[PDB]
Write a protein that binds this ligand. Structure first.
Ligand SMILES: CCCCCCCCCCO[C@@H]1O[C@@H](CO)[C@H](O[C@H]2O[C@@H](CO)[C@H](O)[C@H](O)[C@H]2O)[C@@H](O)[C@H]1O
Ligand SMILES: CCCCCCCCCCO[C@@H]1O[C@@H](CO)[C@H](O[C@H]2O[C@@H](CO)[C@H](O)[C@H](O)[C@H]2O)[C@@H](O)[C@H]1O
Ligand SMILES: CCCCCCCCCCO[C@@H]1O[C@@H](CO)[C@H](O[C@H]2O[C@@H](CO)[C@H](O)[C@H](O)[C@H]2O)[C@@H](O)[C@H]1O
Ligand SMILES: CCCCCCCCCCO[C@@H]1O[C@H](CO)[C@@H](O[C@H]2O[C@H](CO)[C@@H](O)[C@H](O)[C@H]2O)[C@H](O)[C@H]1O
Ligand SMILES: CCCCCCCCCCO[C@@H]1O[C@H](CO)[C@@H](O[C@H]2O[C@H](CO)[C@@H](O)[C@H](O)[C@H]2O)[C@H](O)[C@H]1O
Ligand SMILES: CCCCCCCCCCO[C@@H]1O[C@H](CO)[C@@H](O[C@H]2O[C@H](CO)[C@@H](O)[C@H](O)[C@H]2O)[C@H](O)[C@H]1O
Lengths: 447, 447, 447
């Protein structure tokens, strides 16, 4: 009388709630709310850090992303990731417009479909504002919204299915990704690098010669963003057990400690490299690097190793940021360095420190990693993170370039010398007051 | 040995907690905390949107409202709405100063009195800062606080009882109001219109001729407010089941989707009406309109209809805002257009799309609306929303006018030409710095 | 097969989760997240209130404190407070680096070790940013971080053990401290007074003669801080039951009401003392005073007495702030007046109003206070708050002075007249822009 398909049964004849522990559902409902406030967190963070005045306010853009992503998820995003009749590479349109999404056990069986929909939808939205922030410089809004809908559909949704889906080939292969380091962070990072390399401003003056590595538009914005992100990450990582067990709280302790050691580590590196300065921007980026690092690992690794997930990503991401000098590109490179590089490092290290007895805390069964002499685990992590990077860079490139050849879908004006025109363009962007301007400052052309 | 009255029994002889599912209580406790942060959310929103410099900071005023409303609720607000011995129009003073408020099942039987008190108290506080924001222009603080205490007592509390109370006549009549669209939004909106029409500044220059429809004091404030409100609304709507079932999470999905489609819809309307501009203020107002729209409906309607609750309120509220031109009044009209008009539209539409099988998800029994060929439901919604609008406008008018004839209770100086006096009044309000001024800039008169 | 020691048992043979109610764990997990956002709350509050421009941004410093405190807690802070093999004055290094912290019932038996670790760790972090804010004026960052690690280890951890530990002598003596008014507020306040008296700037011009009592750096910052603190305090106080019972929600109602009456009370006192001005800073400080006041009491006293916990601390703390005039010291005195004095008053009053039938709501057994003719309870409170004040002032003094005699550990330059040097020092601090400066403005000396 509980069917385990469609709606899960007839509400007029059964209590669909009897299939689930109530406390499990409450923790996952709460966690969903927490992940949501991470979305403006991303916006405040990349708005503040910018070494350039972005015409588009990313704090505002975070609300736009929340709107676009929620409609995409409802329309067919959810179905494409978490339908029960999927192949090994993709879901279906079976839950188009959330049809029959109710009380059947979700692919995470301790919660029903409708709760898993709510939870996982927040993950797609966080990824959308990361993507929007990566390609925001001189972006046209219309094209940006279209781009996000397309990118969530053909880049986020396939990768998410491989990672989390019923018959996802990475699931079947035995690759570990606790809280979606692959679909969210690694994914958005390498999509950001496609933006940088194809549409980013080349020979950029903020990224060339002896200019300061850190030159923030707004420190108070960076801090507010980091606050929202660290606060929300308890639901992001802690809710990825799908339950109310103590593995949830174990994963929260790991999240806190990786952030803390990441923050301190990056600020220490900067101290050595500057000859004794204390970096305010760097402490914040280090916390984000630890959070990203521990994401694929938080419910799999022992508590004292969570420190390594703060330390090692902070060091490597800190140096990765220097590649902006080498390439002389600024646009999009911060998101690649933190989420792309940090996601890769964290996914790799999970292969080293995953432990079957950490997973077993709530009955979850894994072979483990190098901790349990499971050497081959490292190979499973690499196949995951290489597949994710390859698909993300390639398909994001194809979308950017294809939209670039269509005049009314082009995301960024090509900027391909009238004295009067240059004076006007400068003043157009310089005089704008985002605080009081009721309208988006749309990129301006020769007409 | 569980009495079901007063305190519910003797703590020294029974565990009063045995009467309730623990997960139910945890979700409602959590939801209470969430609703609380909506209070500064309202303050930041209406502070930012203002086309005029308000002498009173509404962000600060939100904390004042939290103080006044919590004391009023404790004193007799709770008793007047949720006492167990009420008539059909009002409660009693039986729980004066929260006497014997403990472990008896509340009128929402899945939680005890003391938890329902906490939860529903947040609803009264949200309504108080909406009211304070509606009548803040040139308000005197002393009179404003008194006004709020009186207005919560004789306007909020009767309407809330009709909607939610043990023998409330709207409850008995079969009108649907899931999360209090009536007591909170519709109520505060039509009380706002009474302020506009009786005390609002007439022939206002920001609302007359060809002046810009949107001219915000602070965009970053609007965005921060919208963030807090959308975040908190998960508890506002999701906790209105009184339990931990999947109807709670179903209602959260509806809340997210209505906000998203409301945001996109209002920004699209503005795009047509401006000939291609992207409205930053409008995206935010559209999200608020959807949230308001879905409030009476969130746990009653099917997921794909939640889109309509974003779209239709966004369009109608957008045009309602133009009535400010027609009347040449600005003061108080934003709250009427969003909460008054949006609450009305959402209450009406609930009569159309309510479905007994959506309610049945957690065992709740309703005849449903037009979805279940229950045509008469639309008539029940209209009687609710007309009663609410009539009582709110009339009794708020009477309070405003009565306080206006008492010199030391008058809320706003009548402003009924010395050259020197006008220069001084202008400079008084212009020179004030809210960031650093330790005191409220009290309205200034000829002495 | 549940051992009740070390890890609590073998995860491969038992479900350690069977020992606990799931709803209990979910509420305490949620509460932990809430307490965390109180940390930037403290930072925003004391940044905004300052009558001086602090070279160190306290909003930023709150994230630093979160990093340092999380690492200290992991390293040995947790072990020193909540190890199961402690003496009567201190814990052990048994859980060094969180070794074997998992599934054994914690000293609060309704939650496991790993969840109690997470929860109580937030309390240590809140105390760390209070301490950092108290001694931030002209602080050198390196020394400040070292200082925090040392102070949490030898001041916070002993006092916390006495209050909360397995064999803590204050626990055994029967002193009541519901949510840690002793370890957090009283403690940090009297440590702040040691800073003021030993390192604070003497004959300070902002604290001398006829200068304004309130002269805030940023009102919007005070308000944002108060918002985060009041929001988080629901977890701070509500989670101190260790469970999901209605005593948790009872304690939340008490928290809300004490804040509200504290806010209104302080603003009323200021109104009398200024001859009719409305104090924006004072409403906020009054809310904080009530929150502090009700902290040792929230789950022990009857609801209508929670009003007294707002009123009496607001009055006394308001006058305590005047002692800054008497001493002509500003540095560190705000934290003493609010948390030191307010913690003392609230601890004292708990001895008066504690009621065994309030505790009994969830089965907790106490003799009660003067409500249950238990006169001796007042003596137990005094011994607690005198021990806490004595240990905090003395050992903080010794740490400050000892670091002051070591050139590279000195927290504040001694400031012990070149015309050119004075012009330069003035311009150094005046010209700094915290919004855009990528580095901490380190105190500057003659080289
Ligand atoms: C499910 C989510 C989907 C939401 C809706 C998506 C709609 C997007 C389609 C593109 O729309 C165009 O985008 C603007 C570019 O941003 C256009 O140009 C506007 O902006 C300038 C571009 O900078 C132009 O030069 C024009 O002056 C001005 O009309 C604007 O007219 C509009 O036609
Ligand atoms: C349970 C919640 C209730 C909380 C307490 C409510 C108390 C309110 C009563 C009214 O109080 C008056 O309000 C001020 C007006 O705002 C008065 O004028 C003050 O403000 C100016 C008005 O603009 C005046 O001209 C005077 O100079 C100045 O004394 C002030 O003196 C005070 O008498
Ligand atoms: C577990 C948490 C622990 C985290 C790490 C703690 C490390 C703290 C040790 C002290 O470090 C010193 O602190 C700076 C003082 O703040 C020093 O001077 C720096 O700052 C100026 C002091 O104002 C000096 O004059 C110098 O120019 C400049 O090098 C800096 O070099 C560094 O040696
Ligand atoms: C780079 C760091 C990778 C850590 O890899 C180590 O390799 C295993 C082998 O060198 C260690 O011993 C592991 O070897 C297993 C096989 O005997 C045992 O069961 C032990 O429990 C287990 O510590 C294991 O701890 C782990 O730290
Ligand atoms: C304005 C939009 C209002 C929608 O009202 C419709 O009216 C009912 C009649 O026209 C529809 O059929 C309803 O009629 C019931 C009576 O047979 C059936 O049981 C069906 O389930 C049910 O779809 C119902 O869906 C509903 O959409
Ligand atoms: C300063 C304010 C301290 C309040 O102390 C009072 O003292 C008790 C004695 O004066 C009161 O009666 C208490 O005395 C007990 C002994 O008979 C009874 O049981 C009553 O329940 C109890 O109200 C008690 O309420 C309490 O308010």
């Amino acid at each position: 009388q509980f069917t385990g398909t469609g709606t899960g049964g007839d509400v007029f004849k059964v209590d669909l709630n009897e299939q689930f522990d109530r406390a499990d559902m409450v923790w996952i409902g709460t966690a969903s709310v927490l992940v949501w406030i991470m979305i403006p967190g991303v916006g405040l963070l990349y708005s503040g850090i910018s070494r350039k005045k972005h015409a588009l306010s990313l704090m505002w853009a975070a609300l736009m992303a929340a709107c676009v992503a929620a409609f995409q998820w409802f329309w067919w995003g959810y179905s494409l990731v978490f339908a029960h009749n999927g192949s090994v590479f993709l879901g279906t349109l079976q839950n188009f417009c959330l049809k029959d999404v109710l009380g059947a056990p979700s692919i995470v069986k301790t919660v029903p479909d409708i709760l898993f929909c709510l939870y996982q939808g927040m993950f797609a939205a966080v990824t959308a504002i990361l993507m929007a922030g990566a390609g925001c410089e001189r972006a046209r809004l219309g094209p940006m919204m279209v781009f996000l809908f397309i990118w969530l559909t053909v880049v986020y949704c396939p990768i998410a299915y491989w990672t989390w889906g019923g018959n996802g080939w990475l699931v079947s292969l035995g690759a570990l990704d606790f809280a979606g380091g692959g679909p969210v962070h690694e994914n958005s990072g390498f999509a950001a690098l496609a933006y940088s390399l194809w549409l980013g401003k080349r020979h950029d003056p903020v990224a060339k010669g002896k200019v300061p590595k850190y030159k923030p538009h707004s420190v108070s914005s960076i801090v507010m963003g980091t606050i929202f992100l660290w606060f929300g990450w308890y639901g992001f990582n802690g809710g990825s057990t799908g339950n109310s067990s103590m593995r949830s709280w174990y994963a929260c302790v790991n999240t806190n400690l990786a952030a803390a050691t990441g923050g301190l580590t990056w600020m220490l590196v900067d101290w050595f490299r500057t000859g004794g300065k204390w970096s305010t921007v760097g402490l914040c980026m280090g916390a984000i690097a630890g959070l990203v690092g521990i994401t694929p690992a938080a419910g799999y690794v022992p508590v004292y190793t969570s420190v390594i997930f703060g330390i090692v990503p902070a060091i490597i991401c800190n140096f990765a940021v220097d590649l902006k000098d080498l390439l002389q590109i600024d646009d999009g490179m911060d998101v690649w360095a933190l989420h792309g590089v940090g996601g890769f490092v964290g996914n790799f290290m999970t292969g080293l420190f995953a432990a079957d007895y950490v997973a077993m805390i709530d009955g979850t069964e894994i072979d483990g990693g190098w901790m349990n002499h499971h050497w081959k685990q490292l190979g499973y992590q690499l196949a995951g993170s290489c597949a994710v990077a390859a698909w993300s860079f390639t398909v994001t490139s194809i979308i950017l370039l294809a939209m670039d050849r269509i005049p009314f879908l082009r995301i960024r004006l090509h900027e391909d010398g009238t004295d009067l025109a240059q004076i006007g363009e400068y003043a157009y962007y310089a005089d704008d007051d985002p605080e009081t301007n009721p309208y988006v400052l749309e990129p301006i052309d020769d007409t």
